[PDB]
Amino acid sequence: RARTTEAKFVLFTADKEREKTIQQIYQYRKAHNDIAEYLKDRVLEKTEP
Amino acid sequence: KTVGNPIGWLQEMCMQRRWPPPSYETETEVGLPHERLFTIACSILNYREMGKGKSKKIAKRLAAHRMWMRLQETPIDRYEQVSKDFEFIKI
Amino acid sequence: AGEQKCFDWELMTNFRRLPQSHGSNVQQREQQPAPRPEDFEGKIVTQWYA
């Protein structure tokens, strides 16, 4: 949604949940990276199920 | 301070000393389905201790830990303000 | 010199940008130089705590 140039994305979390939300965000980033690399490396001639 | 498996230690003490194995009873289940509280009892000989928790597992573990300590012992009107020095920490 | 006026070079060579208002904790305030009145006379200040 924050699609403008130099946009700011702000997260509000409490102190006790900082570690868990940081781990959650890293998990989301890892999922995004895995999606990207799976879409990149995979090659198929049939290209249809 | 409940670092470990206190129920395992409790049953270890029970069966090592040939004391009766730890009996466990569930008396009450109170609260709304998304905030139910569970109450688990533990009874060995004449000692009976209570453990409460959001889950039956947690309440059972707390009761076991409590009586494990027991058997070793006996052989504002205001919201707090926040500082303005908060910064934006990159993630 | 005299009634003639000239450009105020020092202020602009100092105030390229307005310094940002930052608070000071007791630890770093302890060894800071003691405030002296003539540095606070006829100047601009702001409350960083409020």
Side-chain angles (χ1 to χ4, degrees), chain A residues 10 18 22 25-26 29, chain B residues 86-91:
Chain A
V10 175
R18 193 164 204 277
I22 277 174
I25 296 290
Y26 294 160
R29 293 180 189 176
Chain B
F86 85 100
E87 74 291 346
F88 291 88
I89 310 96
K90 193 171 280 261
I91 178 169

Side-chain angles (χ1 to χ4, degrees), chain B residues 18-84:
Chain B
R18 302 302 190 277
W19 287 29
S23 187
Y24 294 98
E25 185 179 38
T26 308
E27 298 186 311
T28 49
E29 295 194 33
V30 195
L32 276 182
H34 53 271
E35 329 176 3
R36 284 171 290 71
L37 249 202
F38 300 91
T39 291
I40 301 297
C42 180
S43 307
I44 303 154
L45 292 158
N46 310 324
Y47 291 78
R48 194 171 185 281
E49 284 293 339
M50 272 295 148
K52 293 176 182 176
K54 180 64 205 97
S55 266
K56 294 200 182 197
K57 177 261 178 154
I58 289 170
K60 174 111 165 203
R61 196 177 70 177
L62 192 43
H65 160 114
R66 163 37 47 213
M67 152 176 216
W68 189 67
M69 331 315 288
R70 195 77 184 114
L71 200 135
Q72 289 170 92
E73 291 174 351
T74 52
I76 181 170
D77 323 302
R78 317 286 296 101
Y79 287 106
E80 69 203 350
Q81 294 300 104
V82 289
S83 65
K84 290 178 68 177

